[PDB]
Amino acid sequence: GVFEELLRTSGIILKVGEGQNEIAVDQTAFQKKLRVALEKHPSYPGVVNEFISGLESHIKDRSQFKNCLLPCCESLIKLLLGIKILQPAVVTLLLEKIPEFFFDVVGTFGTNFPRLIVNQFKWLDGLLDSQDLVKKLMQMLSVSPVPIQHDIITSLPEILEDSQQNEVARELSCLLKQGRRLTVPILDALSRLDLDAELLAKVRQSAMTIVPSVKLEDLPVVIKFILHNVKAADAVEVISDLRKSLDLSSTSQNCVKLLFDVIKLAVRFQKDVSEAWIKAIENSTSVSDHKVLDLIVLLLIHSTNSKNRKQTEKVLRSKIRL
Amino acid sequence: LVDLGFSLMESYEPAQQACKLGASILLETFKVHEPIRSDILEQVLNRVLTKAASPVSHFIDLLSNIVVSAPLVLQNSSSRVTETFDNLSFLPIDTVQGLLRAVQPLLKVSMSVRDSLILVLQKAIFSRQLDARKAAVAGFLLLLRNFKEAFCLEILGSLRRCLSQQADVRLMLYEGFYDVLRRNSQLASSIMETLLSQIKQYYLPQQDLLPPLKLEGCIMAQGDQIFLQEPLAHLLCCIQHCLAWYKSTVHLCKGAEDEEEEEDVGFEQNFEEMLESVTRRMIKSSGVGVKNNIYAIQVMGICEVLIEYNFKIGNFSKNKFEDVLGLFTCYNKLSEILKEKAGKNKSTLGNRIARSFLSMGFVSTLLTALFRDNAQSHEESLAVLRSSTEFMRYAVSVALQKVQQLEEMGQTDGPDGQNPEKMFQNLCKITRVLLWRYTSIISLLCLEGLLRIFNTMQQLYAARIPQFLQALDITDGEADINVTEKAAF
C-alpha cells in the first residue's frame, strides 16, 4: 500500500488492533511534515485520489472506524483533515458515510457511527468550503430516521459555521412550523443560533401554534421557551396570549406539579412575570374565563414571593365577591 | 432562633459587629440541635442567590461558613441546588465566582452535582456565554474534578474558539492559563499550540523589520482594534510564565514529555527565537494614554516580561545584565507622560505611581540580590547595574507597591499569588532583606516599607503575630511578652 507507506513515513504510527493508535510526533509537526512532504510526490497534481482510495480501502472494518474516529490531539480523521491539499476532499469522502451507516438496528450498546461521523466536525478552525458544509448538510437531513434527525440537528450550533445565521434559522423555523420529532431538538437548537432582531417574533408567534396541541411532557420545555425571553413591556400581551392558550388542566401528577414548577421557577426568577402572570387573569376574564389553573396560581403567587401579600389579596377579594 | 438568624444576621446592616454577631445565632443554631436546620440552609441559598449586589458579603460569607461547616450537611441532600444552579447566568461579575467557590466543597461528593453543572453551563457557551461560562470552564478545569474518554478536551477547544470574543474573555483565558496549567498534566500541548497561534500573528516574521513589534504590530490576543486585544504585555505575560511553564513552570523539566528531547522547539522554539528578537529589536484605539500605556505599554511590559526572560535566562553573564540596563533605559524613556520612581518612605500605601509588575517572587529575587545581601565572586555586573542608582532605587517601588496592595485588597496579582502561605513566606523574606541594608548602611527604602510591613502584617492578619514577630529577629522566630525579649530587642 503506497498510501500506507506515505502515512507511516509521515510519522503517525500504525493504529492496528482495537487499541487507540499511537502517533509519536509533534501534532503541528505531524500535520506540517506530512502535508509538505507529500506535495513532492511524483504526480503532485495526481496522487490525492490514488491515496484517498486507499483511505476508503481502509474505511471498511467498523473498528477501524473507531480507531479512525476515536481521540488521539484530535483524531487521524479529525486532524488528518487539516492538510488543505486534502482540505476540500475529506468532507466529501466522509459526509456521505452517514446514510448507509444509518440502516442497522441501533440501540444502547454504543457504536452509533452517526454519532461520531458528525461529531468530529464541531470546533473546526480551518476547513475549505464555507457554504458547502451546511449546504450538503441540510439535504443530508432529508430522509434519515428520527435518531439521525436528532443528530444532524443536534450539533447545529458549533459544527455549522457562523455565516448564514438568518438563512440557517430560515430553514429552521419552517422545518419546525408544525411537526412531531422537533419539539425537543429543534426547540432547543434555537439557543445556539443567536438569531437576529428580525426572525425573533416570527419564532415566537410560531411557538404558540404548537403549544395548545403540544405533546405529553414537552409542556415543560414549551413553557420554558414561552417565558424565556418574553421579559419586556411587550410581555403583558405575552401573558394574555399565554393565558388564553394554556387555560385549563385536563392529568400528570408530575405533570401538573412540574407545570407549577416552571411557573414557580419563573414565578420569582424573571423580572416582570410577577406583575404579568397575575395581570392576565387579573382583569381579563370578563365572562367565564376564570379556571382551575388560573386560580391555583393565585396562591403560588400570593405566598411564594413575599412582596405580594396585599397584591394577591385585593385580587382574590374582587374576583370572589364579584 | 433560626428565624432570628436568617432575619438578623443578614439584614442587620458595632453595626459590622451586629452582623458579625448574627453569624453566631444562625451558625450555632445550625451547630447544636440536629433536626431543624435543613430548612435553614434552604432559607439561605435563595436568600443570597437572587439579589442585588450588597448580598455578596454578609450572606456570601455566611453561606461559605455554613456549607463549610456543613459536614456533608447536603452530602446526600442536594435537591434545592440542582435547580438553584441554573439561575446564575444573570448574577454580577464577582458573585458568580464566589458561588462557584463556596459550592466547591460540595462538588467533591457526587456526579449528580457535576453531571448537571456541566450541562447547565455548556449550553451557555454555544450562545452568548458571558464570563460566567469562562469562570466555570476554568473552575471545573483548574480543579481536581478536572482529573478524570477524555473528550472534555472538546471544551478545552471551546475556549480556544472563545479566544477571539472580546477583551474581557481575552484577559480571563489568559489569567488562568497559568493555574489551569499548574494543575494540568496531560493538557500541555494544547495550551502550547493555542498560544503559538495567538503569538504566530505577532511581530514582523522576517528579521530586519524596523520595529521587531509595534503597538499595532503584534496582531492581538482577543480583539485588537478599538478594544485592546490580549494586552500586548498580557498576551506576552501569559507567554512568559507559560514560557517558563513548559520547562520549569508547569513541568520543572517535562523530562518525560514537555521538555523531553529539548521539546521547547514546539511550544517555545519559536518562542525563544521571538524572545531574543523582541529584546534585540529594542533599538528604535488609543489617542494618547491607551496607545502609550497599553500599546507601548506592551513595550512597558515588553521590558516587564523581558526582565524575567533575559535576567533570569542565565543572568550570571554580563550580557543579559547589559541588556536589562538597556531595557530600563527604554522604560525610563517611556516615563515621559509623567515621571515614576522607587520606594524610600513609609509604605502604608505602596509606591508613588505604577501598574502591574513582574512576578510574585520577583520582589524577592531582585530586592534581595541587587539591593544588598549579595556579595560574592561574580559581582561584576551586579556592580555595573549595581551602579545604576536610578534603575535600582527606582526598581524598588515594584516591591514597595506589590506589598502596599497585597494586603490592602486581599490578594495581589501574580502567578502563584493567592494561596496564603505563599503570600506569607515571601511576605517575610521581603522584610528581612529590607532590614539588613536599611539597618546596615532613596535611602529610606528597606525601612519605609516598615509602616506597611507592620500594619498590614498585624492588622490584616493577627493569628501570626508570634510566628512572624520572632521572624524579624535576626536568624530566629514565645508571645508578645514570651517573645517580649524578641519584641523588646
* Cell reading at B13: 446592616
Cβ-based neighbour number of residue B485 at 10 Å = 9
- The answer to whether residues B416 and B182 touch, using CB atoms and an 8 Å cutoff, is yes
In the structure grid, which three cell numbers stand for residue B64, read together? 461559605
Find the CB nearest B189 among A73, A157, A192.
Answer: A73
DSSP B290-348: HIIIIIIHHHHHHHHHHHHHHHTSSTTSHHHHHHHHHHHHHHHHHTTSS------S--S
Torsion sign, CA atoms B22, B28, B33, B35: positive
Q: Which residue of A has its CA nearest to B150?
A: A71
What nine digits make up the cell of A127? 476547513
Nine-digit cell string for A228: 424565556
Helix (H, G, I), strand (E, B) or coil at B138: helix
Grid cell at residue A137: 448538510
Q: Which of A265, A268, A298 is nearest to A280 (CA)?
A: A298
| Rg over CA atoms, chain A | 27
Whether B165 contacts B220, CB under 8 Å: no
Calpha distance B447→A4 (Å, rounded): 72
Distance (Å, whole) CA B214 – CA A193: 37
Where does residue B206 rank: exposed (0-12), middle (13-18), buried (19+ CB within 10 A)? exposed
Among A26, A28, A157, beta carbon nearest to B126: A157
Nearest to B156 by CA among B130, B124, B180: B180
Judge contact between B141 and B191, C-beta under 8 A. no
CB B390 within 8 A of CB B332: yes
B87 closest CB neighbour out of A26, A71, A269: A269
Cβ contacts of residue B403 below 8 Å, gap of 6+? B347, B350, B363, B412, B427, B430, B449, B452, B453, B456
Q: Show the cell assigned to B43.
A: 432559607
Burial class, A19, CB count within 10 angstroms (exposed 0-12 / middle 13-18 / buried 19+) = exposed
Alpha-carbon gap, residue B8 to B21, rounded angstroms: 9
The answer to whether A61 contacts chain B (CB < 8 Å) is no
B50 interaction partners in chain A (CB closer than 8 Å): 268-269
Give the residue from B450, B443, B436 showing the smallest Cα distance to B403: B450
Q: What are the two backbone dihedrals, phi and then psi, of residue B471, each rounded to the nearest 5 degrees?
A: -60, -35
d(CA B238, CA B230): 10
Q: After which residues do gaps appear in chain A, with C to N over 2.5 Å?
A: 72, 250
Rounded to whole angstroms, the Cα distance separating A79 from B8 reads 59
Preferred mutation among B161, B165, B198, B269 to probe A, highest tally of A CBs within 10 A: B161
Nearest one of B106, B93, B116, B193 to B143, comparing CA atoms: B106
Rounded to whole angstroms, how far apart are CA atoms B105 and B72?
9
Q: How far is CA B411 from CA A43, B100, B405, B408, B416, in A?
A: 63, 18, 8, 8, 11
Residue B215: name the closest of B292, B282, B270, B281 by CA: B292
Q: With an 8 Å Cβ cutoff, are B193 and A158 in contact?
A: no
A123 touches chain B (CB under 8 A): yes
Cα torsion A11, A16, A19, A25 to 10°: value is: 0
Residues 6+ apart with CB under 8 A from B421: none
Contact A71 B151 (CB under 8 A): yes
The amino acid sitting at A286 is: S
| Secondary structure letter of residue B214 according to DSSP | -
Distance CA A277, CA A262 (A): 13
Q: What angle do CA B354, B359, B364 make, to 5 degrees?
A: 95
Cβ within 8 Å of residue A38, ≥6 positions away? A6, A10, A47, A83, A85
Instruction: List the determination method.
Output: cryo-EM
- For chain A, how many helices (H) and strands (E)? 19, 0
CA atoms of A181 and A192, how far apart (whole Å): 19
Whole-number Å distance between alpha carbons of B240 and B91: 33
Report CA torsion sign: B471, B473, B474, B475.
negative
Supply the Cα-derived Rg of chain B in whole angstroms: 25
AA identity, residue B267: F
Mapped onto helix, strand or coil, the DSSP state of residue B154 is helix
- CB atoms inside a 10 Å sphere around CB B24: 12
Contact of B295 with B286, CB cutoff 8 Å? yes
Cell of B16: 459590622
| DSSP per-residue string spanning A175-186 | HTSS-SS-SSHH
The residues, any chain, with a CB within 8 Å of residue B325's CB and separated by 6 or more, are B384, B385, B388, B391
Q: How far is A268 from chain B (nearest CA, A)?
A: 9
Distance to chain A for B25, nearest Cα, Å: 23
Separation between Cα atoms, residue B465 and residue B424, nearest integer Å:
12
Residue with cell 451547630: B31
Closest CA to B311 of B348, B275, B273: B275
**Residue B383 to residue B322: CA distance in whole angstroms:** 11
CA B479 centroid distance within chain: 33
CA–CA separation, B146 vs B216, rounded Å? 37
Distance (Å, whole) CA B205 – CA A221: 53
Picking from B345, B488, B350, B371, the residue whose alpha carbon sits closest to that of residue B429 is B371
- List for chain A the helix, strand, coil content (%; round to 5): 55, 0, 45
What distance in Å separates the CA atoms of residue B434 and residue B367, rounded to the nearest whole number?
8
Residue (of A275, A190, A171) closest to A228 by Cα position: A190
| Nearby residues of B241 by Cβ (< 8 Å), 6 or more positions away | B178, B249, B359, B415
A158 touches chain B (CB under 8 A): yes
Please say whether the beta carbons of B282 and B269 come within 8 A: no
Q: How far apart are CA A30 and CA A11, in angstroms?
A: 7
Amino acid at B456: T
Give the residue among B26, B16, B99 at the shortest CA–CA distance from B56. Answer: B99
Query: How many Å apart are CA B116 and CA B80, to the nearest integer?
Result: 13
Looking at residue B279, its amino acid is T
Alpha carbons B314 and B240: distance in angstroms, whole number: 15
Q: Smallest Cα–Cα separation from B63: which of B99, B12, B21, B34?
A: B99
Confirm if B223 and B164 have CB atoms less than 8 A apart.
yes
Write the CB contacts of B136 (distance below 8 Å, at least 6 apart in sequence).
B96, B100, B117, B121
Residue B240 grid cell? 512568559
Direct distance between the N- and C-terminal alpha carbons of chain A, in angstroms, rounded to an integer: 89
Instruction: Note whether B127 contacts A27, CB cutoff 8 Å.
Output: no
Q: Report DSSP letters for B32-88, one per residue.
A: S-TTS-HHHHHHHHTTSSSS-SGGGHHHHHHHHHHHHH-SSTTTT--SSHHHHGGGG
State whether A28 and B266 contact (CB < 8 Å). Answer: yes
Rounded to an integer, what distance in angstroms lies between the CA atom of residue B479 and that of residue B139? 40
Q: Using CA atoms, how far apart are residues A190 and B127, in angstroms rounded to an integer?
A: 9
Residues B177/B191, Cβ–Cβ less than 8 Å: yes
Give the CA count within 13 Å in the CB-facing half-sphere of B45: 21
How far are the Cα atoms of A161, A199, A228, B155, B166 from residue B128, in angstroms, in the given order?
Answer: 16, 17, 14, 16, 12
Q: Please tell me the distance from the alpha carbon of residue A91 to that of residue A97, in angstroms, as a whole number.
A: 10
Residue in the block written with cell 418574553 = A230
Q: Are B358 and B304 in contact (CB under 8 A)?
A: yes
Instruction: Give the burial class of A164: count Cβ atoms within 10 A of its Cβ; 0-12 exposed, 13-18 middle, 19 or more buried.
Output: middle
Q: Let me know the angle formed at the C-alpha of B130 by B129 and B131, rounded to the nearest 5 degrees.
A: 125
A123/B154 touch (CB, cutoff 8 Å), yes or no: yes
Q: How many CB atoms lie within 10 A of CB A13?
A: 12
d(CA A105, CA A315): 58
What is the rounded CA–CA span in Å between residue B478 and residue B271?
51
Residue among B139, B132, B49 nearest B89 (CA): B132
Side-chain half-sphere CA neighbours of B188 within 13 A: 28
Q: What is the resolution of this structure in A?
A: 4.1
Give B143's Cβ-side CA count (13 Å radius). Answer: 16
State the DSSP string of B362-408: HHHHHHTTSSSS--STTHHHHHHTTT-SSSSTTTTHHHHHHHHHTTT
Q: Are B232 and B218 in contact (CB under 8 A)?
A: yes
Compute the distance between CA of residue A243 and CA of residue A236 in angstroms, rounded to an integer.
Answer: 10
Nearest to B405 by CA among B343, B466, B340: B343
The total of other beta-carbon atoms located within 10 Å of residue B385's CB is 21
Contact B113, B107 (CB under 8 A): yes
Measured CA to CA, the distance from residue B294 to residue B315 in angstroms comes to: 28
C-beta separation of B249 from B181 below 8 A: yes
C-alpha cell at B364: 524577592
Amino acid sitting at position A70: L
Task: Report yes or no: B143 and B104 within 8 Å, Cβ to Cβ.
Answer: yes
Q: How far apart are CA B359 and CA A11, in angstroms?
A: 40
Nearest CB to A71: which of B123, B128, B150? B150
Residue with cell 401554534: A209
Residue owning grid cell 514582523: B204
CA distance A211 to A52: 49
Query: Is A274 within 8 Å of A305 (Cβ atoms)?
Result: yes
Q: Is A33 on the interface with B (CB under 8 A)?
A: no
A192 interfacial to chain B (CB closer than 8 Å): yes
Tell me the three-class secondary structure of A258-316, residue by residue: HHHHHHHHCCCCCCCHHHHHHHCCCCCCCCCCCCCHHHHHHHHHHHCCCCCHHHHHHHH
- What gap in Å lies between CA B65 and CA B391, rounded to an integer? 47
- With residues binned 3-state (H G I as helix, E B as strand, rest as coil), the percentages for chain B, rounded to 5, are 55, 0, 45
Q: Name every residue whose Cβ is closer than 8 Å to that of residue B424 and which is 6 or more positions away in sequence.
A: B464, B468
Q: Per the structure block, which three cell numbers stand in for B474? A: 535576626
Q: Which of A71, A87, A70 is nearest to A34 (CA)?
A: A87
Q: What is the largest CA-CA distance in chain A?
A: 94
Task: Write phi, then psi, for A143 (nearest 5 degrees).
Answer: -130, 30
Q: Count CA atoms closer than 13 A to B336's CA, side-chain side.
A: 10
Q: Are the beta carbons of A123 and B161 separated by less than 8 Å? A: yes
In angstroms, rounded to a whole number, what is the distance separating the alpha carbons of residues A292 and A21?
63
Residue B163 CA to residue B278 CA, distance in Å, equals 23
Place of cell 442536594: B78
At B212, the amino acid letter reads P
CA angle B371, B348, B300 (to 5 degrees): 55
Q: Is A122's CB within 8 Å of B189's CB?
A: no
Query: Which phi and psi (to 5°) does residue B359 adopt?
Result: -70, -165
Spatial contact of B65 and B27, defined as CB atoms under 8 Å apart: yes
SS (H, E, C) A12-62: CCCCCCCCCCCCCCCHHHHHHHHHHHCCCCCCCCCCHHHHHHHHHHCCCCH
Return d(Cα B142, Cα B403) in angstroms, integer.
Answer: 26
What grid cell was written down for A34? 506530512
Residue burial B291-318, b: 16+ Cβ < 10 Å; e: rest: ebbbbbbbbbbbbbbbbbbbbbbebeee
Query: What are residue B265's phi and psi, to 5 degrees?
Result: -45, -55
- Residues of B in CB contact (< 8 Å) with A are 50, 83, 87, 123, 126-128, 149-151, 153-154, 157-158, 160-161, 189-190, 193, 196, 265-266
Alpha carbons B161 and A126: distance in angstroms, whole number? 12
**Complete DSSP assignment for B262-299:** STTIIIIIHHHHHHHHHHHTT----SSHHIIIIIIHHH
Measured between beta carbons, the chain B residues lying within 8 angstroms of A29 are 266
Give the largest CA-CA distance in chain B: 77
